[model samples]
Target: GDKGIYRHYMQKEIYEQPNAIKNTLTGRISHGQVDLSELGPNADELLSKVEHIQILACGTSYNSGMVSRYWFESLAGIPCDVEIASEFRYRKSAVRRNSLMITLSQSGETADTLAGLRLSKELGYLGSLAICNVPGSSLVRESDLALMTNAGTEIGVASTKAFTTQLTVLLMLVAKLSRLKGLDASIEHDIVHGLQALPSRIEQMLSQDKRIEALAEDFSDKHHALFLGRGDQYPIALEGALKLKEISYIHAEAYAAGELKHGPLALIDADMPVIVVAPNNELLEKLKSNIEEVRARGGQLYVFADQDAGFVSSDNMHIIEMPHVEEVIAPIFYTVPLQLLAYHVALIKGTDVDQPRNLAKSVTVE
Candidate 1:
């Protein structure tokens, strides 16, 4: 009912991330602990028994699941695999017993995702869960457990808040499941504190609106772009490329930094802009080597690095400093600038950011 001061639903939804993340986390965590019993009465038992996780979704939803795979494996020490729902439904794959099948969707009515859920049921997954934005859509009704994100109504064809909110819900699930595996209290305390500060961190990111717009100007005329990252940030790079192509109509691709020399290096040149997403983590040094390879090839680099990441600026290389955050949530924080970059680039190109051409808000039919 309210557009606020934004020009389009996409921009409004992009800025609504703080409130969306806060709403998703509220009442679900307290006292340095997370409680996902709201998922279901038997949530604890189901999570405890889960030997691995299988995630299914489409488009932006699938990207969120990609990031969740990192969370599940790193934090919970649980093996997780992600599959595009349509592909998974059409192919035969091994489904281990006691595997938790999780589906992510904003509308909760994506045909392929729902079909994948049905396939999971037929294969004897231990339980099924849906992390969605819609409260009573088919996904919620059919799943054994449902965690709804209060992102309100998303009118944009290209998703923004929904993706981040899904990440919030998935991150909470990781913390809860890890506890069942005997996660330490001190580690839990740090994660909870980070969650509480997440909203303000997002607010800080939103305050860089003008800077992002300025950066978007550089991308307006580019014909193609490359995104690179390492570790958990790699999925964020993929999501960034998706957003750019979805809204701005620019050709884009994402590659893990370590994989650059294998192929993508051939595409790097002065005309091509390469965006790197690097946090100050164990992989930062390895990512730096990738940056050097790009620099040697005359590629213009736009780096989104952590505040203390120590990336020096040069004539052809640009750097934007992002706020440093806890390792568990750093990926979430880095997402903001990339979303803003896509929205601003679409604005600059006058390409209908909210309802991009040839895209429907929900892919329900096929």
Candidate 2:
């Protein structure tokens, strides 16, 4: 069962990540150098016209939007709100007229997301952009501008390369907007270098499959999984929660670590497993405190951290130390272990890791 088309999807997706990163980076600003000629002078004025970003998406794209929110705010100095297409369409949302409505989708045909963008346009929100994979999908055709994720072809029902590639694209969009809005230059060079190195880093991370497989027994039978992170890391947490649920059918939820005391911590007991993203950034120290809070409640912890982060716990905690990637590229690095976790969990649970039940490779229907 393991030696077939499904297995190829997994291995191929793993190898595809590097090129996906490169493809997403193809026309982007990097390494303190931005070829603004590509975006055109008209986009500079467009940047000045928008006050906020309203992101509509579903599934893995929603996770990308979550990460986009942090980048948008940091780089472009604009507030952003990411809403699930299904929930957003049904609810009465406060959509700003001056907001740039960006919709993210892999297929561009997810019934609700496409409909949601149409609804936004009908409601007079015209500054629309799409981050999508398929060029001719409804989303790409409908949007004013589109950013594509070149992961080649993703046959796996459970998304991997697309998710990271989505992150790379979204991050670049923010970088472009930041330069248009005149943000500081400190981040430009490092961010570009980080993007260039992503493919190799991802390949290296995939080589740790043996260790990842060994830890599957710890995750397979878990009833609840809690993912915690902050800032840009928050979206990675959301993606982690999604993988577990999509592949293994585990009940998973993600919380921004700062919001732990508000509600998510109540779900923290020994029965629920908690995973923390501990990258070596400004959020690391604060994450350490949240990790302790989870440990104090007897929750088993699996930390995917950077080497310098120092997240070590003997009994109830296990650490997967990733290479020290640039803060801008940390999401790409952290994604590897989480994808492995989902794959191994599904393997142990006897679920179809590549083709989960009732989920389509691409939703071509409206």
Candidate 3:
């Protein structure tokens, strides 16, 4: 195993993120500039005419797509829709005119996604783009264009590095389209700058491994966990829940925080550990009320917030402060600790962190 010094491939892949991200950015972007040379010369012409984004994927890759919809819609002013590939391939949904089909996958061999990419042709999509990890994999071979995530082979059953690298490529895709769409020059500059700075920021997040490991101790006896976030970070919350359930064997769920009172509020109690991704964003105040609602219900809370978010921990809460980051890229940075939490918790529970039971490295079959 190329795990090197790490105990499991999952932990090794988690630590490799900084370099994985750096490698993904290498040659593609430098000094706050997005170079879409890899997406081919026809990319600009295709992206210029693109009126909408129709994204398809499954599992962790799908969560990356959910986060990208926020970027594609807000920063690029492009309408975007995301659907689970398994469902999308079977459904009869209205396909918008000039909608560019994009699929995100690490292995790029997932049955549903590959089939969806093929089906998108019949659905009259303008073109197909595969944001994939493995170069020349089936999805990439079949797509009109491909953006490689460069995460290398993720040996772990549950994806970690692949997800972050997918976001890196997707954010760059947004920058490329934003430039083509005449979005404010400074907006694209900020996004490119964020991409330039991500590797180091991810390193800073990884340095908090000890703290995350300590927190995992509390999760050992807990059978259920809840994760909460809003805006772009909501997908990160979903990813966090998926990671927890995948390796730690805990029953985990994520909510948009705003949706807590709608139904999930009923599940709150001291017995259920509630994790909140409260990075300092526009919705922090709205999220504060959600946290307060959980507090009143005696739900034990573990909050990962921006350093200056001004949240304090007490008997029922633990505030874990992360470095203050901009809202646009907070999801990428926040993803690091969530992966560590799952890894450490699974270590505590003595489950096979690298190869969880009933899961394959790649879902190549239906």
Candidate 4:
């Protein structure tokens, strides 16, 4: 593959998603399905020892940690807190001796995450495990255990396949650990199937790139953007905003839909592009109301809604209907569209689509 082309890197990374998920699946109990049975050796015992789980990271990696928090709590009956590595290292938080702290980083060399790992070790965390990509990197060596993402070398400065792969791999790790702990195996098989099915799904997602690319025309002209979601999608909002700001140089903000009136609504105006991630979930009504609040303020609304929701739209209000999926797994699905949107918007503005100016693939400095 030619290394200079950014779009090629993006597409290559997108196509690589399935392989990444499959490799992650291998470490789990997905023999028939996505069961977490591989943790048979110590699953139950380790799980019993775990009182809490703390995840620390930065940027896209941090978002994956946030999604993992929901998964750990719901599927494994574990409590998890996602923290920024920088803040976690600087401030003293309640760190329990029985807690397992996981650091999520694409490159095992993110400066603050490495520091946070040191802090966690010093605080007597049960143990530190790193979910990192680069083999033999500092993070992999620094942590006691690690799960590496199978995502191939990511050349784009802005992450594409690496982000999705990181998320899928992390999900599989959680699933594997859950099974090891003797959790119910009901969701295992299908979840594994889901992981295996992801690459093709991502390919389908890439085919629809034109729509996202076209939308970028609008996005490139905007100064500030707002992203909103609920539940796991909240992290999707954060990733979306991070991508836009990191590459397109737009002033973007992500907020939980319920927090709209608390402050975000005051920033709404016609020129502002408000991208609302409205998946079919418990918070749909509140999400709709949040959209209405923005519309009432003449804010341009771009919605990525589920197919069953049947949202209507106008010029100022655009809708991208997405596939129906499990609420728990929706974060993975919603991320594709947001990534494409960021890619296309950067392309439209003729910005450095892959490696934006002033940013590295991984920030190794504090």
lDDT values of the candidates? 0.85, 0.76, 0.87, 0.75
Which parts of model 3 have CA positions greater than 4 angstroms off?
A: 279-297
Q: What's the true lDDT of residue 298 in model 3?
A: 71
Per-residue lDDT of candidate 3, residues 109-165 (tens digit): 999999999999888899998999997989999998998888778899999999999
The true-versus-predicted C-alpha distance at residue 318 of model 4, in Å, is 2.5
Give the Å error, residue 286, model 3: 5.5
Q: Quick one: ranking by TM-score, best first?
A: 3, 1, 4, 2
* TM-scores for the candidates: 0.95, 0.88, 0.96, 0.90
RMSD from true fold, candidate 2: 3.3
Q: Candidate 3: lDDT over CA atoms?
A: 0.87
**Candidate achieving higher lDDT, 1 or 2:** 1
Give the CA lDDT, 0 to 100, for residue 208 in model 2: 71
lDDT of 2 at 31: 39
Model 1: per-residue Cα lDDT over 1-366, one tens digit each: 778997999888988999988899888986568877776465687789988999999999998999989878877888999999999999888988689989999999999999999888888799898889997988999998989988999999989999988998888888787778887756665667888888898899999778899999888988789998787888999999999999999988888877877887788786678888964545555544655676766777788987777777777667888767778788888988999999889988999887898988988895
Query: For residues 153-231, could you state the per-residue lDDT of candidate 4 as single tens digits?
Result: 7777777667787788667766666766677887555556666666677666667778787778887888898898777
